């Protein structure tokens, strides 16, 4: 549905 390579990058920001 969405770009896995773009989801995992954005979820890395939410932690920080």
């Amino acid at each position: 549905l969405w770009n896995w390579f773009d989801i995992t990058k954005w979820l890395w920001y939410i932690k920080k």
Partner: antibody
Amino acid sequence: EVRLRESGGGLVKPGGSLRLSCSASGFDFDNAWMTWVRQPPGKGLEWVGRITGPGEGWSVDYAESVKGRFTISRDNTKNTLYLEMNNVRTEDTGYYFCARTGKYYDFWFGYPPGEEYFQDWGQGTLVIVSS
Amino acid sequence: ELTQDPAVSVALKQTVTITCRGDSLRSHYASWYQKKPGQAPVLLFYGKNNRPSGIPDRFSGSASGNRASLTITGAQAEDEADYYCSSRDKSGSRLSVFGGGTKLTVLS
């Protein structure tokens, strides 16, 4: 329910070409990722390459010892995976396996883009390359 | 990249730990596969702590630093095979890679 059938192997001379196929059934093929892995006779497994899904633009990643010669595609209408191999050499010999790729990403300790693990496996097809 | 020991022997009912070393293991998890001659590989362990259903609970994994270990609690005669660790080739890369290969030789 998962079933994978590799096909299209046999004898081929160096510099020749061959198109391998992996038909699948029993799960959702249109969104699942697929990966080709090869093993030379009496040696180790080697990641050939995978094809992603719809959200990623159906992008494909290849191995460094593979780039330029092989191509990976798919056909959701027939639920078959394809591996076209061109200008083949005697090192590329071995069983090619098609594996359903899982996506893993630890929200906390994981580093992007996560990891890829190979859940289900077909029992492979033999491709011998010798002059 | 992903470095292993080539051959490790273990006695029956003993515990054997197969290791895997690589720079990408410092940021990525590892997956382990069992390869028998004439059979398709079988996913054994992956991620932080995931065992696929259908695998005996003696197979487990660990991760610390540039090292990932596959521990077998009470090795059986059915566990002589080729074990391969798999992770990313580089930290933050889209490419996967396998290890060299550890031939587990169970003496019975």
